[PDB]
Design a protein around this nucleic acid. Structure first.
Lengths: 176, 79, 82, 111, 59
RNA sequence: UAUGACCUGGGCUACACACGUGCUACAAUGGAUGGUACAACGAGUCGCGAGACAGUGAUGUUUAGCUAAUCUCUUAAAACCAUUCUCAGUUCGGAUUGUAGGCUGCAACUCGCCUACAUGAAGUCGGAAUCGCUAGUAAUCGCGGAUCAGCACGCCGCGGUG
C-alpha cells in the first residue's frame, strides 16, 4: 500500500497528542467499510436490484451478496427474500486498496462541498457516510449510469474515540 | 481473496494515472491497481494531473470563487 | 441607471433625519424613492393611502421606490390563491 | 477536475455539449469553443486529447455551476424579504414580472 | 366631471405624462387623433357632415 | 358643507376556476449557413432621423438628407446555395427566473419595455366537438399608420408568396 507507512509514521505524533502514548504496537486503527444499496425496492421485480448487484460487482469490492430482512414488511409484502440491496463488507488491506479513491479520487471527483458529515456520530469511534450517485472510478462507471441506484459508506475505527476518529480519517484526504 | 475470483479485479488495459496513483494488477479501478509507473503498461496521464485539491473546496484554497457576496445586493451609485 | 432618479422632500428627510434623528414616520408619497447605504438603520413609513407603514430598514432593502418598499399592494389574500 | 470531464456525449458540438451541461452557453461556450479552438468538434465520439486540458480552466470561468445553484440559492435566499413584494410572488410561485396573472401562465401558476 | 374632465386637462398639469390630450368638445379618452387634434368618437360626430377629402361611405 | 373638487400614491389590470382569445411550439420545408429581391411605406426638416458608431442591443456617439414623386425609414420574408442537428422531450421547445445594462419619462412592480447571457418546464400534432375556407380564396409574409414621452401576436389598411 502507501498509507500504511504514512499512516503509522504520521500518527506517531498523533499518538502522543491523542489518547494513548507508549502503546506503540496497538494504537487506534481503522477496521473496514461496508458498501450497500440497501434500497428496499425489491417488490417491483428485484431484477433492477439485480442490476444493482452488478453495480456492486461494478464498484468491485468483492462478491456482491445480499441480505434477508428479518421480518417481511406488510407495507412491502416482500416475503422475506434474499435480494434487498447489496453487501460488501470489505475490509483490511483491501480497504487499503480502496481508500485512495476516498481521499484523492472519489469526493474530489464529485466536488460536492467537501462532503461534510460531522453528524456521523456512531457513539464509539465509528463514522457513517452515504452517497447518491457515483460518477466515481473512471472507465468503469459509465454507459450504465442512467440512474445510480445508490451506495452507503461506513468507516469504523478500532477505537471508541469519535473525535480521534475524526482526526483519523480527516488526518488524510477529507475535511468535514 | 476467494480462490479464482470470478467476481471482478479484472484488468482493463488502462492507467490510474496521477493522484489516483495506481498502475495495474488483477484489479479494476481506483485505489487498487499497483504502485509504480516506471515500466508503463500505459503511461500515467489520461485521468488527471491535479490532486485531491482538484476538488474546488481547496485549490490554492479555491478562493477564485471570491469575489462574490457583498456586491450582493448593493454597492452601487444608481438611483 | 444612467441619469438616476430619487426622492426630493423625503430626500430632505433623508437629510433631515440622517443628521437629526432616525425615528419618525412620514406622510409619504413615493413612487420615486431609493435607499442609500447611509439610509440603513432607521424607520420610514410607506404610503399605501391609509396606513403610513412603519418599517425600519435593513441593508437588504436595495434602492427601490416606496411603491415597492413593502407589499402594500393590498390584495386579500389567504382566501383562494395558487 | 472534473468539470469538462463530466458526462460526455458524442455526436455534438461542444457548445451544445455544454448547454447540455448546467450552464456554459452561447456567449461563453462559443467563446471557449474558440478559446480552446474547438469548432464542431465533435460529431466524433472523441472530444480531443488535450483541449480538455485547455478547457479545464478555460472552461472554468463560470463561477460556478454548483454556485449557479448556489447563485440562484445565494441570490434569492438572501433575496427573500427585501419587500417581500417580489420574493413572495417568486416563491409562492408566480412569474414575478409584475405579470398579469388573471387566467394564463397556467402551468407555473398551477391548475 | 365635465369640468374635471374638460377643464382639468385645459388647466396646466405636470407634463404630457399627466395631461393627455383629446378633443375640446368633450374630454373623451384615447383613440384620439393627435395628428388632427380631435377624438375619433367626437370627430365622428362631425363625420355626420365631414369636412375631409376622405370618402364618406365607410371605405 | 358634496355623488362638487386640489394633492398623494395604492387599486382599477389583482386569481381557487371556466369559456372569450391569437401567437408560439411539438419539428428536417424546421433550426442554424447567406445574400438576396420585391409591393408597401406615412407623419415629418415641429419630426423622421445615414455608409459618421460604443456595441450583445436598448440608445448615445453624428445626425448627413429631410416642406417627400428628395431623405433616414423604404435594404421585408419565404424561392437561392453553403454546412450540419436527420430524429430525440430534439443545436431543441422558449416557462420563468436571477440578474448585468440601456431607452422612455419626474419617476418601469402594481401601473412599459428592450438587449444580453446562464439555467430552457410544458410540448412529440391535439376528446366530445366547433368554426372558417368555391380566388390571389384559405394559407402565408411584410410594411406603415393606430394609440402615444414610454408602450400593439390579435388592432386599420396595403400588398410579397401561393
Amino acid at each position: 500500500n502507501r498509507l500504511k507507512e504514512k499512516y503509522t509514521n504520521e500518527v506517531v505524533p498523533a499518538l502522543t497528542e491523542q489518547f494513548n502514548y507508549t502503546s506503540i504496537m496497538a494504537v487506534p486503527k481503522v477496521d473496514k467499510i461496508v458498501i450497500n444499496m440497501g434500497v428496499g425496492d425489491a417488490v417491483n421485480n428485484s431484477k433492477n436490484l439485480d442490476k444493482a448487484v452488478a453495480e456492486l460487482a461494478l464498484i468491485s469490492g468483492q462478491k456482491p451478496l445480499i441480505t434477508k430482512a428479518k421480518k417481511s414488511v406488510a407495507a412491502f409484502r416482500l416475503r422475506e427474500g434474499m435480494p434487498i440491496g447489496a453487501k460488501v463488507t470489505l475490509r483490511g488491506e483491501r480497504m487499503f486498496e480502496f481508500l485512495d479513491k476516498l481521499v484523492t479520487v472519489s469526493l474530489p471527483r464529485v466536488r460536492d462541498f467537501h462532503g461534510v458529515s460531522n453528524k456521523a456520530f456512531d457513539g464509539r469511534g465509528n463514522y457513517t457516510l452515504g452517497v447518491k450517485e457515483q460518477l466515481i472510478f473512471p472507465e468503469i462507471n459509465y454507459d450504465d449510469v442512467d440512474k445510480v441506484r445508490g451506495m452507503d459508506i461506513v468507516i469504523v475505527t478500532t477505537a471508541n474515540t469519535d473525535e480521534e476518529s475524526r482526526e483519523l480519517l480527516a488526518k488524510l484526504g477529507m475535511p468535514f | 481473496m476467494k480462490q479464482n475470483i470470478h467476481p471482478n479485479y479484472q484488468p482493463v488495459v488502462f492507467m490510474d494515472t496521477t493522484t489516483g496513483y495506481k498502475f495495474l494488477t488483477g484489479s479494476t479501478k481506483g485505489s487498487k491497481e499497483t504502485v509504480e509507473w516506471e515500466d508503463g503498461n500505459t503511461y500515467p496521464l489520461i485521468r488527471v494531473e491535479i490532486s485531491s485539491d482538484s476538488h474546488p473546496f481547496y485549490t490554492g484554497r479555491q478562493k477564485f470563487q471570491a469575489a462574490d457576496g457583498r456586491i450582493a445586493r448593493f454597492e452601487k451609485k444608481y438611483g | 441607471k444612467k441619469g438616476p432618479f430619487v426622492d426630493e422632500h423625503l430626500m430632505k428627510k433623508v437629510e433631515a433625519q440622517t443628521n437629526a434623528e432616525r425615528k419618525s414616520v412620514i406622510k409619504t408619497w413615493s413612487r420615486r424613492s431609493t435607499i442609500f447605504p447611509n439610509f440603513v438603520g432607521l424607520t420610514i413609513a410607506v404610503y399605501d393611502g391609509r396606513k403610513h407603514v412603519p418599517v425600519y430598514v435593513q441593508e437588504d432593502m436595495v434602492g427601490h421606490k416606496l411603491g415597492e418598499f413593502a407589499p402594500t399592494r393590498t390584495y386579500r389574500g389567504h382566501a383562494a390563491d395558487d | 477536475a472534473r468539470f469538462a470531464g463530466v458526462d460526455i456525449p458524442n455526436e455534438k458540438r461542444i457548445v451544445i455539449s455544454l448547454t447540455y451541461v448546467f450552464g456554459v452557453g452561447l456567449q461563453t461556450s462559443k467563446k471557449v469553443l474558440a478559446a480552446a479552438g474547438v469548432s464542431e468538434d465533435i460529431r466524433t465520439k472523441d472530444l480531443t486529447s488535450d483541449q480538455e486540458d485547455a478547457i479545464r480552466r478555460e472552461l472554468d470561468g463560470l463561477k460556478l455551476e454548483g454556485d449557479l445553484r448556489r447563485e440562484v440559492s445565494l441570490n434569492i435566499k438572501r433575496l427573500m424579504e427585501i419587500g417581500s413584494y417580489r420574493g413572495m410572488r417568486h416563491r409562492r410561485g408566480l412569474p414575478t414580472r409584475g405579470q398579469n396573472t388573471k387566467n394564463n401562465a397556467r402551468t407555473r401558476k398551477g391548475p | 366631471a365635465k369640468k374635471s374632465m374638460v377643464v382639468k386637462n385645459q388647466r396646466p398639469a405636470k407634463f404630457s405624462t399627466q395631461a393627455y390630450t383629446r378633443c375640446e368638445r368633450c374630454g373623451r379618452p384615447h383613440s384620439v387623433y393627435r395628428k388632427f387634434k380631435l377624438c375619433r368618437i367626437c370627430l365622428r360626430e362631425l363625420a355626420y357632415k365631414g369636412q375631409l377629402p376622405g370618402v364618406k361611405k365607410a371605405s
